[PDB]
Amino acid sequence: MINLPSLFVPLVGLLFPAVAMASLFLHVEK
Amino acid sequence: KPTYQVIQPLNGDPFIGGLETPVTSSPLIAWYLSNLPAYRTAVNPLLRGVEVGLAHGFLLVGPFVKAGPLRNTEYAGAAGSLAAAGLVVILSMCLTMYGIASFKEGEPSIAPALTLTGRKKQPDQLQSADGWAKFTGGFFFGGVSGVTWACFLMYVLDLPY
Amino acid sequence: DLEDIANTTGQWDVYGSDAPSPYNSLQSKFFETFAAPFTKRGLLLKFLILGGGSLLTYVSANAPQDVLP
Amino acid sequence: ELDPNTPSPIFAGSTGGLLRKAQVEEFYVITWESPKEQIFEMPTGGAAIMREGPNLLKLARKEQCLALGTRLRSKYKIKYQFYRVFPSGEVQYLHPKDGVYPEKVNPGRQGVGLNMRSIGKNVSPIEVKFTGKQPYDL
Amino acid sequence: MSHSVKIYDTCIGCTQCVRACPTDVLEMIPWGGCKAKQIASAPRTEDCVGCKRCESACPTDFLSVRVYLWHETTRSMGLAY
Numbered sequence A: 001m002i003n004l005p006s007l008f009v010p011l012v013g014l015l016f017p018a019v020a021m022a023s024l025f026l027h028v029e030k
Numbered sequence B: 001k002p003t004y005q006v007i008q009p010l011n012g013d014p015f016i017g018g019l020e021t022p023v024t025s026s027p028l029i030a031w032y033l034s035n036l037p038a039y040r041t042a043v044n045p046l047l048r049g050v051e052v053g054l055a056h057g058f059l060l061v062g063p064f065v066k067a068g069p070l071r072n073t074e075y076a077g078a079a080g081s082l083a084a085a086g087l088v089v090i091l092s093m094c095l096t097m098y099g100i101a102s103f104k105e106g107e108p109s110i111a112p113a114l115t116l117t118g119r120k121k122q123p124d125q126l127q128s129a130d131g132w133a134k135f136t137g138g139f140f141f142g143g144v145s146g147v148t149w150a151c152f153l154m155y156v157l158d159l160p161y
Numbered sequence C: 001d002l003e004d005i006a007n008t009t010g011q012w013d014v015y016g017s018d019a020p021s022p023y024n025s026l027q028s029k030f031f032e033t034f035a036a037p038f039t040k041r042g043l044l045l046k047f048l049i050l051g052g053g054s055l056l057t058y059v060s061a062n063a064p065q066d067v068l069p
Numbered sequence D: 001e002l003d004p005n006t007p008s009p010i011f012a013g014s015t016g017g018l019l020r021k022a023q024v025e026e027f028y029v030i031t032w033e034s035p036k037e038q039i040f041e042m043p044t045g046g047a048a049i050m051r052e053g054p055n056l057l058k059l060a061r062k063e064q065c066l067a068l069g070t071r072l073r074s075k076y077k078i079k080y081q082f083y084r085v086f087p088s089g090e091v092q093y094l095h096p097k098d099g100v101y102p103e104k105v106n107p108g109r110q111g112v113g114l115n116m117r118s119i120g121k122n123v124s125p126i127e128v129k130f131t132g133k134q135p136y137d138l
Numbered sequence E: 001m002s003h004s005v006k007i008y009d010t011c012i013g014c015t016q017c018v019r020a021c022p023t024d025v026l027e028m029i030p031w032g033g034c035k036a037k038q039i040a041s042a043p044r045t046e047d048c049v050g051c052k053r054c055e056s057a058c059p060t061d062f063l064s065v066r067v068y069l070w071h072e073t074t075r076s077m078g079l080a081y
């Protein structure tokens, strides 16, 4: 296929954040 | 007729602020804003959803297709959608988990009309979660979609000059 | 008394809060369930935040022959 | 409002007092007497007049509506009077209750002043570890 | 505590001494002998904010109060709005 290891910066530095900024708006409510 | 309405600070009592001047309550403006969610809730939030989704939709194009990160695109997937069919999505649940600051759980259906409304204490809330859904659901199909007759429209353009 | 003009039509007046346009174009239930799944909203959003956001980023990052950083 | 227009404390406009959080929660309002038509100072920055009615201005929050005194008793009058309005009724009868003028004697009401032990040598720090069985909930 | 700052003293006389402080302090509650016989440290304190205007004047001879309340409503800070 050739040259493709780019997912562990969005799933982390991008999407993991989405989760918790969403999710953890559990501090406001759930 | 008078000096400027029957001359008044607010609707009435002057101990609430608002200081109703123009730019506040001139029949010149306050009518340019009430088929929509200004004074009165027309139909439910359902439909207003997409005129809101869509209008705000085909915006955010030349903003991120003419000011894009490496700009003036020669990629057939820009001058339109590209990514920004991301903003509407990063914010079409920037909303849903604000309608979790709305719950209040019902199902009346009163977008049909009865006796000349008021929705009365219509201020404060009095729009439950099963409302704020059908709006921010109108939002996605208004955002994503409103991004393509931007894109889809070729581009006949007026220029500098 | 000529300029006593009896307020050349009173109006009634105060129009209203009453009634200076009908309402919203008949375009509606031309979306009835059309686009549902936020009109089946009955438990969702967790679905559209793995799905939509694994396909604004799965293929969105990867690429078959760079055009690099 | 107007169809019922019951006013007393003249003003005209102002971006000062009362806004959203005095419906959705509590209310607070001051009332008074006066001799003959006199121009006052105001909380919220502005300034107007008097004469009578109830002489019943409504006020945002109660630190705001006693300052009619911290000047509005350097301008004659025994009587000035602020209560507590809700969005529905009572409990907290604010300048109501018994006697008035903070510095007389009918009853004693609350206060106390002591804790357990008095001001004396609390070089004694915090004692027991907080544990559900020894009189430290006061 | 939830409004617990001690201004007490020993005279608790309040003439050319201290009055200042939005609502909070409806005292004069004469304890059975303390000179100008009016005493203690407060009345019902669940009403107003967090001054130390509380001393500034008329003795506390020790400390003087300030903020210490933590548990802190809003009505207990201007801004709940």
Ligand code: CLA
Pocket (backbone or CB within 6 Å): A009, A010, A012, A013, A014, B068, B069, B081, B082, B083, B085, B086, C055, C056, C057, C059, C060, C061
């Ligand atoms: C930890 C994180 C991090 C990561 C991984 C990124 C990553 C990125 N940033 Mg970024 N950024 C960050 C932190 C980060 N940023 C921070 C902290 C800031 C503030 C300083 C910025 C400010 C910033 C700006 C101003 C920009 C970026 C841009 C970008 C993108 C550049 C290349 C690109 O076009 O994207 C690759 C992928 C996408 C953009 C999404 C792809 C979606 C496509 C594939 C969908 C189209 C097809 C169709 C419609 C969908 C089909 C759905 C179907 C299933 C129904 C890249 C995704 C730029 C950009 O994206 O402009 C183009 C530019 O806007 N960033």
Ligand code: CLA
Pocket (backbone or CB within 6 Å): A017, A018, A019, A020, A021, A022, B090, B093, B094
């Ligand atoms: C010019 C720059 C500058 C810089 C370099 C910094 C740097 C810093 N500031 Mg800071 N700050 C600044 C200006 C700056 N500040 C200014 C001008 C102000 C106000 C005048 C502040 C007020 C401020 C406060 C109050 C604090 C800091 C803190 C910090 C530190 C926390 C770092 C961190 O990683 O948190 C990372 C930040 C986040 C994770 C929050 C951002 C959330 C965003 C991305 C969400 C976007 C919402 C989006 C639309 C919703 C999409 C939905 C999705 C989530 C599902 C860091 C030292 C904090 C500190 O002391 O910590 C030790 C904190 O106390 N700052």
Ligand code: CLA
Pocket (backbone or CB within 6 Å): B018, B019, B020, B021, B022, B023, B024, B025, B029, B030, B033
């Ligand atoms: C982005 C905004 C910012 C914000 C949050 C505010 C907010 C406010 N302004 Mg304000 N203002 C702003 C920018 C802003 N202003 C600017 C840049 C100016 C020019 C100096 C003013 C001049 C101004 C005045 C004179 C007044 C206010 C007032 C107010 C307050 C109430 C008025 C109101 O909401 O009527 C509702 C507003 C509308 C219904 C706006 C409709 C206009 C739209 C349709 C324009 C569409 C543009 C059109 C397509 C072509 C124009 C192109 C381009 C040149 C813009 C409110 C706090 C009033 C006040 O002090 O409080 C009572 C007061 O009257 N403003």
Ligand code: CLA
Pocket (backbone or CB within 6 Å): B060, B063, B064, B065, B067, B068, B069, B070, B071
């Ligand atoms: C505060 C701002 C400042 C401004 C003005 C800009 C502007 C820009 N940055 Mg940038 N940047 C900034 C700070 C700024 N940056 C900082 C502090 C950092 C480090 C933290 C960066 C890191 C960065 C990177 C890596 C990149 C940029 C890029 C860009 C460009 C693309 C923006 C884009 O497409 O978004 C989309 C824009 C919109 C959707 C705009 C819509 C709304 C706007 C018009 C505001 C609304 C006003 C509206 C008209 C109201 C008027 C009244 C109305 C009723 C008519 C643009 C030139 C990208 C670039 O490549 O530069 C050429 C690149 O990706 N920036």
Ligand SMILES: CC1=C(/C=C/C(C)=C/C=CC(/C)=C/C=C/C=C(C)/C=C/C=C(C)/C=C/C2=C(C)CCCC2(C)C)C(C)(C)CCC1
Pocket (backbone or CB within 6 Å): A020, A021, A022, A024, A025, A027, B091, B094, B095, B097, B098
């Ligand atoms: C109206 C409207 C709209 C919407 C809006 C909205 C709705 C918004 C929202 C927004 C949101 C909704 C946001 C959010 C954010 C978030 C955040 C900001 C979060 C976070 C975070 C963090 C960072 C955390 C931290 C922490 C915690 C808290 C816990 C503990 C500690 C720690 C550190 C962990 C728009 C504009 C679209 C347009 C249309 C109209």
Ligand SMILES: CCCCCCCCCCCCO[C@H]1O[C@H](CO)[C@@H](O[C@H]2O[C@H](CO)[C@@H](O)[C@H](O)[C@H]2O)[C@H](O)[C@H]1O
Pocket (backbone or CB within 6 Å): B107, B108, B109, C033
């Ligand atoms: C995709 C199929 C759409 C066709 C409609 C059938 C199912 C609609 C999904 C809701 C599930 C309950 O089924 C329902 O459908 C009808 C709408 O057509 C309902 O009719 C109504 O139901 C709601 C109940 O508060 C009301 O807000 C609306 O007036 C209307 O939608 C009947 O109450 C019932 O039969």
Ligand SMILES: OC[C@H]1O[C@](CO)(O[C@H]2O[C@H](CO)[C@@H](O)[C@H](O)[C@H]2O)[C@@H](O)[C@@H]1O
Pocket (backbone or CB within 6 Å): C059, C062, C063, C064, C065
């Ligand atoms: O690696 C990124 C590379 O792959 C893309 C992403 O859409 O798509 C390829 O997949 C189609 C499917 O048939 C192939 O025909 C062709 O290689 C591309 O369309 C392409 O954008 C990127 O270049």
Ligand code: SF4
Pocket (backbone or CB within 6 Å): E007, E008, E009, E010, E011, E012, E013, E014, E017, E018, E038, E039, E040, E041, E057, E058, E059, E060
């Ligand atoms: S010390 Fe202060 S308030 Fe305390 S008793 Fe005297 S003046 Fe009264």
Ligand code: SF4
Pocket (backbone or CB within 6 Å): E020, E021, E022, E024, E025, E045, E048, E049, E050, E051, E052, E053, E054, E055, E065
């Ligand atoms: S010192 Fe405390 S109690 Fe006394 S007035 Fe100030 S805030 Fe109120």
